[PDB]
Short mmCIF file of C-alpha atoms in Angstrom, two decimals:
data_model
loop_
_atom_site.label_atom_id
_atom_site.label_comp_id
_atom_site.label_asym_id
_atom_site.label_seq_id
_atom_site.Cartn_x
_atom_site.Cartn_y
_atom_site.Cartn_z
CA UNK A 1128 11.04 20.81 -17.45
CA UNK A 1129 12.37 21.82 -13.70
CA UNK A 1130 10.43 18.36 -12.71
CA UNK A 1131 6.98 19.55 -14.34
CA UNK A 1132 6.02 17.02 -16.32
CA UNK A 1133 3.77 15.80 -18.95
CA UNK A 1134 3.24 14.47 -23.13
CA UNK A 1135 2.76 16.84 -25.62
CA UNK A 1136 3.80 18.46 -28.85
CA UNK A 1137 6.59 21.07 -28.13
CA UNK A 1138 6.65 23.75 -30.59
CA UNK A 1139 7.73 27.36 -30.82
CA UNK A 1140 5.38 29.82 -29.48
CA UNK A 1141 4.61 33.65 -30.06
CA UNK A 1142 3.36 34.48 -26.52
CA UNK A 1143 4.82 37.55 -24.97
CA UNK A 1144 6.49 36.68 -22.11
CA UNK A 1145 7.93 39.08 -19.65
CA UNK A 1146 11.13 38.38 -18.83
CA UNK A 1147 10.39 37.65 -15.05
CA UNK A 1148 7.87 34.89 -16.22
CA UNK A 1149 8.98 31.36 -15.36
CA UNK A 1150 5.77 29.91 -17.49
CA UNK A 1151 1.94 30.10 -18.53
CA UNK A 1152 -1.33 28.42 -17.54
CA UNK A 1153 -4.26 27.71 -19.38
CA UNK A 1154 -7.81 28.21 -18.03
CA UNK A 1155 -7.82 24.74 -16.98
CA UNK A 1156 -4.64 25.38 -14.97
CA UNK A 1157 -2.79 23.28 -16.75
CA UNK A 1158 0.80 24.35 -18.57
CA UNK A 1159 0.21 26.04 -21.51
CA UNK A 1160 3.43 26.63 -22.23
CA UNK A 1161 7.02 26.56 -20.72
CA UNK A 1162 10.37 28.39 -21.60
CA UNK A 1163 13.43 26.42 -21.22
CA UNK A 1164 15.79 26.10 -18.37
CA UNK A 1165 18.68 26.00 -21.18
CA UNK A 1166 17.62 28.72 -23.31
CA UNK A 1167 15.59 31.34 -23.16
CA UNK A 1168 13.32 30.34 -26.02
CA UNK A 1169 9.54 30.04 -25.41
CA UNK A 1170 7.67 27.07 -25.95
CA UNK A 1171 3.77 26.08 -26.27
CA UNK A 1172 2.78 23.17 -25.42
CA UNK A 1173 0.09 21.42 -26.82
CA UNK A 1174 -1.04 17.88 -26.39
CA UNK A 1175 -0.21 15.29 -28.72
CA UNK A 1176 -3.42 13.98 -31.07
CA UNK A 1177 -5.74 11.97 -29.85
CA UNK A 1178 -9.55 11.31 -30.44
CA UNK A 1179 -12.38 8.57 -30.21
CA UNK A 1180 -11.88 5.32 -31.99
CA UNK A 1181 -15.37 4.43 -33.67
CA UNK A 1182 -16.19 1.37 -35.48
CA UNK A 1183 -18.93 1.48 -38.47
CA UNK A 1184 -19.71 -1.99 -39.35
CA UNK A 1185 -22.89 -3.19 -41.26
CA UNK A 1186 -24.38 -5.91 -39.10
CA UNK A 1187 -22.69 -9.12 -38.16
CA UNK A 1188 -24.68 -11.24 -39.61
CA UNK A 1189 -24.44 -8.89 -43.02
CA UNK A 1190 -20.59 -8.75 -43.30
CA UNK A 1191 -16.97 -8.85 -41.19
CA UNK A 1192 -15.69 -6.08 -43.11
CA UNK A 1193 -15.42 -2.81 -41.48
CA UNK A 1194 -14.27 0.85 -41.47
CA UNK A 1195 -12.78 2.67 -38.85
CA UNK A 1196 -13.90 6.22 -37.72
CA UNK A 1197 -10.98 8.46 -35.80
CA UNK A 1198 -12.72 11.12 -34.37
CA UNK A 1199 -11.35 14.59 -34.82
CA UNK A 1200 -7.98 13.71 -36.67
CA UNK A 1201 -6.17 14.82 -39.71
CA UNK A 1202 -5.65 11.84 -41.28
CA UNK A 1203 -1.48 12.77 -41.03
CA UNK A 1204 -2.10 11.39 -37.96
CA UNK A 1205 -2.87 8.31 -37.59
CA UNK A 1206 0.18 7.02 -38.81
CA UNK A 1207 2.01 9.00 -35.82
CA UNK A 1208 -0.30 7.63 -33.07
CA UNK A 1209 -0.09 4.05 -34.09
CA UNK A 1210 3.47 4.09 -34.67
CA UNK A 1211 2.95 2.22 -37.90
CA UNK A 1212 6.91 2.61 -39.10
CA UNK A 1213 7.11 -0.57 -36.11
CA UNK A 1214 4.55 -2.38 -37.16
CA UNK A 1215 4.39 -5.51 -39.48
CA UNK A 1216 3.35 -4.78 -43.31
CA UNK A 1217 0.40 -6.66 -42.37
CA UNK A 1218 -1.01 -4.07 -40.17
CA UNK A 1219 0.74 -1.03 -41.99
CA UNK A 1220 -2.01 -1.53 -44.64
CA UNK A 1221 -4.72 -0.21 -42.86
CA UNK A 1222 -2.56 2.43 -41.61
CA UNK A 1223 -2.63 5.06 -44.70
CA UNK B 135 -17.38 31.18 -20.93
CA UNK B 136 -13.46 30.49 -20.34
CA UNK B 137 -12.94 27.07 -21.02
CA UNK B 138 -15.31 26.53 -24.29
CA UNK B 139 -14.16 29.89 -25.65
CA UNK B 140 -10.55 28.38 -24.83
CA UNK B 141 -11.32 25.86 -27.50
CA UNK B 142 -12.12 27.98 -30.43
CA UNK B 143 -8.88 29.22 -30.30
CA UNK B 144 -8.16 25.76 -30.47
CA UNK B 145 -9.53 25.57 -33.91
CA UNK B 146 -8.26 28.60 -35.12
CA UNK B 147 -4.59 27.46 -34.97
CA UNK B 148 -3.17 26.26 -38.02
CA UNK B 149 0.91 26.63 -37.39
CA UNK B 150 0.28 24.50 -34.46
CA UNK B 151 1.79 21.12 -34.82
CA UNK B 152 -0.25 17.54 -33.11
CA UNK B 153 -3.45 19.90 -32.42
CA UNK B 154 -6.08 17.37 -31.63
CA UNK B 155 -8.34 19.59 -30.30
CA UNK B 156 -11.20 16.66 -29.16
CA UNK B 157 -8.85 15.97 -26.19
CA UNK B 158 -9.66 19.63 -24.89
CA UNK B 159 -7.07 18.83 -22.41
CA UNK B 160 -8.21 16.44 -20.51
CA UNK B 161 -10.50 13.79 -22.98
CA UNK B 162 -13.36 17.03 -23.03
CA UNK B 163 -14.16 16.41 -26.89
CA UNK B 164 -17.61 17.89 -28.79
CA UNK B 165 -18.99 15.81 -31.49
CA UNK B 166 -20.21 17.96 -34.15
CA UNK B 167 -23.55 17.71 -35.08
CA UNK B 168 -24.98 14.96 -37.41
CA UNK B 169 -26.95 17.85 -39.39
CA UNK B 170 -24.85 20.63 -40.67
CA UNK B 171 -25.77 24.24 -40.58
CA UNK B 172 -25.63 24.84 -44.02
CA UNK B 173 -27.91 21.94 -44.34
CA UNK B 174 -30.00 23.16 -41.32
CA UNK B 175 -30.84 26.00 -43.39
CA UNK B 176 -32.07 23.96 -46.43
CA UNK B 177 -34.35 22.12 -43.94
CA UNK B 178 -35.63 25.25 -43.16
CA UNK B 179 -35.80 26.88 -46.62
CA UNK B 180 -38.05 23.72 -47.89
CA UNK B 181 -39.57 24.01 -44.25
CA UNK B 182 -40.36 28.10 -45.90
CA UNK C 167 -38.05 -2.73 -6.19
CA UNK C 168 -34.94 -2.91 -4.35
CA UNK C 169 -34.59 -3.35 -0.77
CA UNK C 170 -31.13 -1.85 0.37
CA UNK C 171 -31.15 -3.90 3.16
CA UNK C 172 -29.92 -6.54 1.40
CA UNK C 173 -28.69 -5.65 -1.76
CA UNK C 174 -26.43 -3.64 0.70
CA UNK C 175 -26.08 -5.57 3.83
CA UNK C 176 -27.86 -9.14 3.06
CA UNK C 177 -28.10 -11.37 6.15
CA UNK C 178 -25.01 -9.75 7.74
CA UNK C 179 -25.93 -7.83 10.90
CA UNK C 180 -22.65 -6.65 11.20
CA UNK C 181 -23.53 -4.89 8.30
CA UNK C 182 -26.45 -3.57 8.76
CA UNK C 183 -25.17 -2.11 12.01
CA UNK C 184 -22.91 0.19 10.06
CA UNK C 185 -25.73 0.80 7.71
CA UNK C 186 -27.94 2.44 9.92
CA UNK C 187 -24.96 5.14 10.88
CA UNK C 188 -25.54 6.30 7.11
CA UNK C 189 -29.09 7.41 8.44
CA UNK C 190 -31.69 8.05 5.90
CA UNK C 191 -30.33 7.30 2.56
CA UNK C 192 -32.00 3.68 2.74
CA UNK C 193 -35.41 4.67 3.16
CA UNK C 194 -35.55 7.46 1.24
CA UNK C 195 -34.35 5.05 -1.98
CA UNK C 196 -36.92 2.55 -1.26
CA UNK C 197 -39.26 4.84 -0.79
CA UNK C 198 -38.47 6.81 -4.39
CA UNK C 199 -38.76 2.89 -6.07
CA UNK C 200 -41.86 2.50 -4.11
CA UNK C 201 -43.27 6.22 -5.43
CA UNK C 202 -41.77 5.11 -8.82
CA UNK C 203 -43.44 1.86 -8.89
CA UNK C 204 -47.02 3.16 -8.22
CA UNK C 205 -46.46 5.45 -10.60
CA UNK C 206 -46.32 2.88 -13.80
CA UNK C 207 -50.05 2.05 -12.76
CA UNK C 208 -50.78 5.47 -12.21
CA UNK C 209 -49.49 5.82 -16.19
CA UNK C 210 -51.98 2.56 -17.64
CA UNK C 211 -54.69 3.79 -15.47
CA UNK C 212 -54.46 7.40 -17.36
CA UNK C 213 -53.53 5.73 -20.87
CA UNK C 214 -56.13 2.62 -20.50
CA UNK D 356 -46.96 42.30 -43.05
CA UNK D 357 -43.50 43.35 -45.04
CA UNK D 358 -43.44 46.41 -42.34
CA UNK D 359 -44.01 44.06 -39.26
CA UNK D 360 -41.35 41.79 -40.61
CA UNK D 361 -38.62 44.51 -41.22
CA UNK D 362 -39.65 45.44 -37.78
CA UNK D 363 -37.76 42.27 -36.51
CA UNK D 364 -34.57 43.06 -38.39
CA UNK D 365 -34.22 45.61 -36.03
CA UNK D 366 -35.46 44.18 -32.62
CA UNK D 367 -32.80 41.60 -33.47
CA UNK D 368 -30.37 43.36 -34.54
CA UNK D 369 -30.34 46.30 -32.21
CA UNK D 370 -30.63 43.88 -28.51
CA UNK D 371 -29.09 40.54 -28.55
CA UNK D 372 -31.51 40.17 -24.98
CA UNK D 373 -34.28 38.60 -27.38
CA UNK D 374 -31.89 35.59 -27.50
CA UNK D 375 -31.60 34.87 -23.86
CA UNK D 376 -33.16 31.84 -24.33
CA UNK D 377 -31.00 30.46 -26.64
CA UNK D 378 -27.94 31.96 -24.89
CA UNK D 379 -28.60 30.61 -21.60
CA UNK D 380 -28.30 27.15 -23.11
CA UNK D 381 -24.34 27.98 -24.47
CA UNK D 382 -23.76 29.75 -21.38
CA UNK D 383 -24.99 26.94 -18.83
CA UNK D 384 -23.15 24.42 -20.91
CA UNK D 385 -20.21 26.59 -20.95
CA UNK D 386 -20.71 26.85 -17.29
CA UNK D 387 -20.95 23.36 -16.77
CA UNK D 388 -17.75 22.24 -18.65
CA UNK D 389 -15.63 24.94 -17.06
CA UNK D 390 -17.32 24.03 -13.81
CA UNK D 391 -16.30 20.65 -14.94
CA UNK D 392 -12.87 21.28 -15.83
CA UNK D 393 -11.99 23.52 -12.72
CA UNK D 394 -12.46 20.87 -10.71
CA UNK D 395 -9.22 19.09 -12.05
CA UNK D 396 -7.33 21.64 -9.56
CA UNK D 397 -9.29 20.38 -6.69
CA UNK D 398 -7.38 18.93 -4.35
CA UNK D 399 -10.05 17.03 -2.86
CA UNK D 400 -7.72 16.48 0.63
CA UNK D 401 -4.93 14.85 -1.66
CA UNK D 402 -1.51 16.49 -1.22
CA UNK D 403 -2.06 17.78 -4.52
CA UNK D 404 -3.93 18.32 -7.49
CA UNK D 405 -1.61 16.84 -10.41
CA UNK D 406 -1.58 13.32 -10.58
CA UNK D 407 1.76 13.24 -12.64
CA UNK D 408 3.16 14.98 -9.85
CA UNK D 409 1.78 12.11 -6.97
CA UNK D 410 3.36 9.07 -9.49
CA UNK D 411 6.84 11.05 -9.58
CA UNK D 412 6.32 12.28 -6.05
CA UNK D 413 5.05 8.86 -4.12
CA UNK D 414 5.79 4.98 -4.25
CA UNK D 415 2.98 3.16 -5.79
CA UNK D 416 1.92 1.71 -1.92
CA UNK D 417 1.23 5.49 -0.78
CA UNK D 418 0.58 6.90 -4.16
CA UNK D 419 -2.37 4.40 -4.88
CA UNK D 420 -4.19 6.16 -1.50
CA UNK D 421 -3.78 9.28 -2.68
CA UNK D 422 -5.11 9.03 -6.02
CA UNK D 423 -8.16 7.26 -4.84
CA UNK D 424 -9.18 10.16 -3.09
CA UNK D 425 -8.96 12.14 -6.38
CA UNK D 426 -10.61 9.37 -8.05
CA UNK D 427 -13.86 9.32 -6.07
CA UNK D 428 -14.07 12.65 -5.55
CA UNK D 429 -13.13 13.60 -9.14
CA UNK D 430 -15.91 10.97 -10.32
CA UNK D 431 -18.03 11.96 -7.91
CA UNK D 432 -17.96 15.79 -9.72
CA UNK D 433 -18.09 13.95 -13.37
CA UNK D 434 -21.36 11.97 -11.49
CA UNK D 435 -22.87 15.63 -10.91
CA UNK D 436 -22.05 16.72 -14.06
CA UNK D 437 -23.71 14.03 -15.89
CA UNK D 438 -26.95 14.08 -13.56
CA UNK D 439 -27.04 17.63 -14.46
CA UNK D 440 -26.82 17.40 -18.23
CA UNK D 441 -29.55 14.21 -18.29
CA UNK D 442 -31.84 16.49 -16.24
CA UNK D 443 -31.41 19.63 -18.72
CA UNK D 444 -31.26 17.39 -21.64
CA UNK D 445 -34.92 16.73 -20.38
CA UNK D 446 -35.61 20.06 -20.50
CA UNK D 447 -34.51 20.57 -23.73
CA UNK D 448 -36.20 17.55 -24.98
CA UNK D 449 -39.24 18.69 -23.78
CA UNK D 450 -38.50 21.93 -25.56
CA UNK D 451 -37.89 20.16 -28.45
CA UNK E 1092 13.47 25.03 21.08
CA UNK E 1093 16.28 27.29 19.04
CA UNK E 1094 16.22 24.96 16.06
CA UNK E 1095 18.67 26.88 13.42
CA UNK E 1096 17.45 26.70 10.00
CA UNK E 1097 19.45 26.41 6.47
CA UNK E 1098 18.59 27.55 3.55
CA UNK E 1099 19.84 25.33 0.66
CA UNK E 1100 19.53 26.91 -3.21
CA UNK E 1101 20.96 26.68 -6.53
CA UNK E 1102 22.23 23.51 -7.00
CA UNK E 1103 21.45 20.02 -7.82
CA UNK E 1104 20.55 17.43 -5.39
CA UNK E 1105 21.80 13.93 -5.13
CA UNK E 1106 19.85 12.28 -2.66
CA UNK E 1107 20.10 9.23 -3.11
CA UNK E 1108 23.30 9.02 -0.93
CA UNK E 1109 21.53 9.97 1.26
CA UNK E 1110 18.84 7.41 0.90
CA UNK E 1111 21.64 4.87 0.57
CA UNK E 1112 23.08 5.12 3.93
CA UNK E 1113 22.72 2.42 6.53
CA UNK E 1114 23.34 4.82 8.49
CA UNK E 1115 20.21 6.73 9.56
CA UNK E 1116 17.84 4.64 11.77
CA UNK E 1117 14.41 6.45 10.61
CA UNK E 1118 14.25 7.89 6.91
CA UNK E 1119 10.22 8.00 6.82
CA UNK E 1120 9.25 11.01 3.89
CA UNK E 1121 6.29 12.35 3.82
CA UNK E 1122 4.76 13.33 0.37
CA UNK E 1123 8.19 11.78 -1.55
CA UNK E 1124 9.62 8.55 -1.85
CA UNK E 1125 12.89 8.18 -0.42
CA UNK E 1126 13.47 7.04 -3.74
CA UNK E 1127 12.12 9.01 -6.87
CA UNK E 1128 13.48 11.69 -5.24
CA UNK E 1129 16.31 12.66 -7.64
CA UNK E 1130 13.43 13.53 -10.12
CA UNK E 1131 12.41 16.34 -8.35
CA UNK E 1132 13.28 20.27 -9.08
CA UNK E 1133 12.22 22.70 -6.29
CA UNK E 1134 12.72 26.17 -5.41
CA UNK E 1135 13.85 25.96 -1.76
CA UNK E 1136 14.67 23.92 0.22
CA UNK E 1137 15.07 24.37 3.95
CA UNK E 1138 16.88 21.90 6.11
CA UNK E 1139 16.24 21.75 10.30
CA UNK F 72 -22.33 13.41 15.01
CA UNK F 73 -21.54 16.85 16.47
CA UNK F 74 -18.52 19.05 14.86
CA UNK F 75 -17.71 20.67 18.20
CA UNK F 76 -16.63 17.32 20.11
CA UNK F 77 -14.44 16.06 17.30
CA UNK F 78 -12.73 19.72 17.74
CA UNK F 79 -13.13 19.44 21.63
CA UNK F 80 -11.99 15.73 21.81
CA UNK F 81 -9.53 15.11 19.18
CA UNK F 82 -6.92 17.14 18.14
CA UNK F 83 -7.00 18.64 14.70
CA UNK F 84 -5.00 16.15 13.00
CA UNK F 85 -6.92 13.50 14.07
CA UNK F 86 -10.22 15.44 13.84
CA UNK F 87 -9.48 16.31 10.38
CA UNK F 88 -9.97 13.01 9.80
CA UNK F 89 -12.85 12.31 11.54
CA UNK F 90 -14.68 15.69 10.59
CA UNK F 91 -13.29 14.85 6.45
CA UNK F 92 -16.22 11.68 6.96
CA UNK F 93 -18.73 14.23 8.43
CA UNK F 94 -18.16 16.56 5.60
CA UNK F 95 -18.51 13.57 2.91
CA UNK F 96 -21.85 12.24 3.60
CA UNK F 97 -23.92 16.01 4.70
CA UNK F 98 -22.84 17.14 1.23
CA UNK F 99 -23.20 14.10 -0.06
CA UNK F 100 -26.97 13.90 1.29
CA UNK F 101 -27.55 18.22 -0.02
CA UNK F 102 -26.09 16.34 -3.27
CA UNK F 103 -29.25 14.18 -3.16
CA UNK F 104 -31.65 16.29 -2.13
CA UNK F 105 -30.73 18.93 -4.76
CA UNK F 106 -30.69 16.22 -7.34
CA UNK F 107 -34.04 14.65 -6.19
CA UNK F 108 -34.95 18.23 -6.21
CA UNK F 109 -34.07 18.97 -9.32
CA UNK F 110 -36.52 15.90 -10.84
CA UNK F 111 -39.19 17.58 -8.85
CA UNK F 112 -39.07 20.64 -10.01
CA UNK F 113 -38.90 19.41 -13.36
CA UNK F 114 -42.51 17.50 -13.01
CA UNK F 115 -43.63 20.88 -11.36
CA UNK F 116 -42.65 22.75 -14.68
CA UNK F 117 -44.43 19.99 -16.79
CA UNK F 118 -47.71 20.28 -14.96
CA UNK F 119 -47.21 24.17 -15.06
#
């Protein structure tokens, strides 16, 4: 937006902007949230999901099989992240 | 504290849509802890 | 125990040349592994 | 003993001072991830700050010097952050 | 030592002609590439 | 190794180079003497 940029989930926000006020800032001063150069519609922004990947596996010399820990994720997710819709069926299994 | 009290708000949000809060912005996550409050207090209950 | 000499600058006096321009932070290292060193025997004297 | 105990109620309940020693942890973790964080906007003698903005703004030959001197410095803060926390983990530990 | 100033506003900016003349003998930016250019959005712009 | 030549000598946009490297190491060098400090203090506490 106006050559700011960045990846995140664009939604519609209830923050009271004053009309003179181009956009927001977080503490980290970072955009919190933008209104559009088109309209005058106010938008948070809010970074798309992400988390640790974690692997619990019994020991190696126990088994191969494994589960997968996604830190700090709906499970909705995971789906999204991966892009699973491209994938081939045989990785879509593990994906839901 | 600005930041840290910036993230519970984080949690509170439920309309918001792809809130991963981990990533505070910038890949600042906090693990929660392995032994839950609730069961904190049992520990301390049988501890009583 | 780690020499910085030439973990740093080994056999290159071209090296060591520039080294010295970073003043003190050489001999204060080796002397911290050197104070951290006597200190293990310091520990098995106390334990043993 | 059931007076002396109801006694507490109150100390605790009417001055949340008795738990400076538990608050000083939150707040000198709190202080250390903002101090963390804030240090995203230094700019460290790099033209600026936002390292989206130096990858739309330079051509990777420049851009790559400019970065680096967000990278070590940046590191360099994440470096003092982490000595900190080992050093008042210790503490802690020791408390513990 | 008069140097008259410009002030350029509300538009959009196609620099890239620019850029793609053979025509100037030094084009050196500082801060932007000459290319790349066309993604940025500023506020003023002030040409000497 | 003095701040006033590099002003006196050089002008400012080369000295801000030059000073930039002066800058780097002194706090660089507070950095370890507050750390080391820090690990001193810490026995100190210990033993008190």
């Amino acid at each position: 937006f106006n050559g700011l940029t960045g990846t995140g989930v664009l939604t519609e926000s209830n923050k009271k902007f004053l009309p003179f006020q181009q956009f927001g800032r977080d503490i980290a001063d970072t955009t919190d949230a933008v209104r559009d150069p088109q309209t005058l519609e106010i938008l948070d922004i809010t970074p798309c999901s992400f988390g640790g990947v974690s692997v619990i596996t019994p020991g190696t010399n126990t088994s191969n099989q494994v589960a997968v820990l996604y830190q700090g994720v709906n499970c909705t997710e995971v789906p999204v992240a991966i892009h699973a819709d491209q994938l081939t069926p045989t990785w879509r299994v593990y994906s839901t | 504290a600005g930041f840290i009290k910036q993230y519970g708000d984080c949690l509170g949000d439920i309309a918001a849509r792809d809130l991963i809060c981990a990533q505070k912005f910038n890949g600042l996550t906090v693990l929660p802890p392995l032994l839950t409050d609730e069961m904190i207090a049992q520990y301390t209950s049988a501890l009583l | 125990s780690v020499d910085c000499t030439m973990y740093i600058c080994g056999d290159s006096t071209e090296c060591s040349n520039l080294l010295l321009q970073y003043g003190s932070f050489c001999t204060q290292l080796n002397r911290a592994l050197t104070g951290i060193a006597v200190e293990q025997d310091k520990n098995t004297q106390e334990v043993f | 003993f059931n007076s002396a105990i109801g006694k507490i109620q109150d100390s605790l309940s009417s001055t949340a001072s008795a738990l400076g020693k538990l608050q000083d942890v939150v707040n000198q973790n709190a202080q250390a991830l903002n101090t963390l964080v804030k240090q995203l906007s230094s700019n460290f003698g790099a033209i600026s700050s936002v390292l989206n903005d130096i990858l739309s703004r330079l051509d990777p030959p420049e851009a790559e010097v400019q970065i680096d001197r967000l990278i070590t410095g940046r590191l360099q803060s994440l470096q003092t952050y982490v000595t900190q926390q080992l050093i008042r983990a210790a503490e802690i530990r020791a408390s513990a | 030592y008069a140097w008259n100033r410009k002030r350029i506003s509300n538009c959009v900016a196609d620099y890239s002609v620019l850029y793609n003349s053979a025509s100037f003998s030094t084009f050196k930016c500082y801060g932007v590439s000459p290319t790349k250019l066309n993604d940025l959005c500023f506020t003023n712009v002030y040409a000497d």
